[PDB]
Structure 1
Amino acid sequence: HHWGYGKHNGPEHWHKDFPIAKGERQSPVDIDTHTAKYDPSLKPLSVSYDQATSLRILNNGHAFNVEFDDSQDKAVLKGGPLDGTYRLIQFHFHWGSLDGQGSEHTVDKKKYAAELHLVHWNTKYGDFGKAVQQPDGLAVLGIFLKVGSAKPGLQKVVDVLDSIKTKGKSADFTNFDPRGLLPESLDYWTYPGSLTTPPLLECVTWIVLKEPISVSSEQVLKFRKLNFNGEGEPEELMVDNWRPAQPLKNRQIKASFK
């Protein structure tokens, strides 16, 4: 039936309703640090989240999204491998049932506990919907989460999860500052790819940060208490909502550092 992460509608079944799953530039991929090409012509990233306006947080049955007002250039991403300005529209995570898995991208086959995706769309396209019809329509900033010490900036998110336990639930979420989620270094790897969930459109320029942020065990534990199911239905814990690494094919992962 509708796609999911279970035995019968998981990633290995997606190709049936979304043929693009077997495309040439699918994500995520495994980043082989030794094969990545250091490209000095890559500019430094420019993240301007000082005027970010968060609106709400919702459980959409696959993960939880924190949405932002993208009607104006409040929070933007520029620099790096990007041309033009990209607006932040939402951010979400992918996580596992155990600390040893959860991320979508892997580094030298190493899986992290979770992965943060900050989704942006190219302003040149007018709206998100048009942007997804273009090879350079989106830019996703990926950040790995390793279990260790608590991340203060993530706590506001952790505290509201109870209100959005089940599919379709949403809660007002204003004044959240996304800058509290960034590692201290902005070094990154970049490659052309796609959305990691259906429709799996190959409209994304992936920018994966080298330095992971650390979060406490108790923080990720709360992610695991979310439900895939809607209220009243049988309980299916929201865990392992990650897609396995896809073949790199004829693409090159570039690094902004040596």
Structure 2
Amino acid sequence: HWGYGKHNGPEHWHKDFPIAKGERQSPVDIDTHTAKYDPSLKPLSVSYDQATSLRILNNGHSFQVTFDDSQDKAVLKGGPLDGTYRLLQFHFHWGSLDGQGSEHTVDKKKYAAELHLVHWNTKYGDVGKAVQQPDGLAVLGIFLKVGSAKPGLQKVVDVLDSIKTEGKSADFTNFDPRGLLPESLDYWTYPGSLTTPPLAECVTWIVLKEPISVSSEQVLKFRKLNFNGEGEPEELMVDNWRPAQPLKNRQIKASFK
């Protein structure tokens, strides 16, 4: 199946998912000097006060924290978005070393990791329907650099030993994703895609300019996860990022001057 290795990695995905070579693929390099400030972008609204986390899961490509999306509890609105988008899950992409791991890049700079908070447009009723629409999903992307620890990440890090291998999950209730956000909500936005198969062109990307800092100990715990299932040859879950794709006929807009 698809993965991040030499024989099943991003350069192979187009064979099973031809949209991999499409017109609005993600991630992209964000050229900060070419992105244009758009004074018409309304303010971004992150309303996570009523979030209900459910489970944490190793899916063989990342780990994810899942939320109750059966009501408007944790929602993203405003910015470039029309309507209301419910938080379904968050997950990360990271590297084998601190100089790579992010999917988006900024003036070709790679960060150590990237957090994706995945939301779907309630006008389509369920996420499966939303993935079939050009404005079905909104992903809030946040860069991670290594320095000081992020206290709001520690509860995640401390349960990873319980989901080491593909297929494992654990209860992960009462987690507050507000603890993963930087101070500023300044952002870049563009129309793109899922960065893992099926690579559907259904995402409004909102990438925050301000990274969060995490400690070396925190990212080291990400790197102890396994791509493999229990009993199979151990292959560390590292470098689970897709590289930047061609921008093609798109403009990246900035919310800030």
Query: Could you say whether these structures have the same fold, taking a TM-score greater than 0.5 normalized by the shorter chain as the test?
Result: yes
Q: How far apart are 1:245 and its partner, in Å?
A: 0.2
2:250 aligned residue:
251
Query: 1:109, 1:86 → 2: CA distance?
Result: 30
- The CA distance in 1 between the partners of 2:51 and 2:129, in whole Å, is 22
> Which whole-Å CA distance do the structure 2 matches of 1:19 and 1:127 have between them?
24
Cα distance, 1:114 vs structure 2: 0.1
- How far apart, in 2, do the equivalents of 1:25 and 1:127 lie? 23
Distance of 2:142 and 2:112 partners within structure 1 = 11
Q: CA deviation at 1:230?
A: 0.4
Which whole-Å deviations, capped at 9, do the CAs of 1:7-66 have from their partners, x for residues lacking one? 000000001010000000000000000000100000111000000000000000000010
> How many Å apart are 1:98 and its aligned residue?
0.2
Structure 1 residue runs of 5 or longer lacking an equivalent are none
Q: CA deviation at 1:219?
A: 0.3
SS at match of 1:222: helix
Give 1:151 deviation, angstroms.
0.2
Q: 1:224 & 1:54 partners in 2: Cα distance?
A: 23
Hey, what's the Cα distance between the residues in 1 that align with 2:123 and 2:58? 29
Render the CA deviation track for 1:78-104: whole Å, top value 9, x for unaligned.
Answer: 000000000000000000000000000
Q: Is 2:105 aligned against 1:134?
A: no
Distance 1:208 1:25 in 2: 16
Paired with 2:210 and 2:66, the residues of 1 have a C-alpha distance of: 24
Partners of 1:192 and 1:37 in 2: how far apart?
Answer: 15
What secondary structure is seen at the aligned counterpart in 2 of 1:11?
Answer: coil
2:213 counterpart SS class: strand
Percent identical: 97
1:83-128 per-residue CA deviation (whole Å, 9 max, x = no partner) reads 0000000000000000000000000000000000000000000000
The runs of 5 or more residues in structure 2 that have no matched partner are none
- CA offset digits 1:225-254 (Å, max 9, x no partner): 000000111100000000010000000000
Q: Could you say what secondary structure the match of 2:12 adopts?
A: helix
CA distance in 2 between counterparts of 1:49 and 1:32 reads 30
Aligned mates of 1:209, 1:16 — CA distance in 2:
32
Alignment partners' CA distance in 2, 1:133 and 1:147: 36
What is the correspondence of 1:1-258 to structure 2 with a 5 Å cutoff? 2-258=1-257
Moved >3 Å (runs of 4+): none
CA distance in 2, matches of 1:78, 1:244: 28
Partner Cα separation in structure 2 for residue 17 and residue 128 of structure 1: 22
Write the distance in 1 (CA, Å) between the matches of 2:43 and 2:178.
17
Structure 2: distance between partners of 1:104 and 1:133: 22
Residue aligned with 1:186, SS: coil
CA distance in 1, matches of 2:43, 2:185: 8
SS at match of 2:19: helix
2:167 is paired with a residue whose SS is coil
Q: What is the root-mean-square deviation of aligned Cα atoms in Å?
A: 0.3
Deviation at 1:166, TM superposition (A): 0.3
- Please give the secondary structure, in 2, of the residue aligned with 1:46: strand
2:218 and 2:142 map into 1 onto residues whose CA distance is 16
**Number of residue pairs matched by the alignment:** 257
Give distance in 2, aligned partners of 1:161 and 1:22: 34
Q: Secondary structure at the match of 1:70?
A: coil
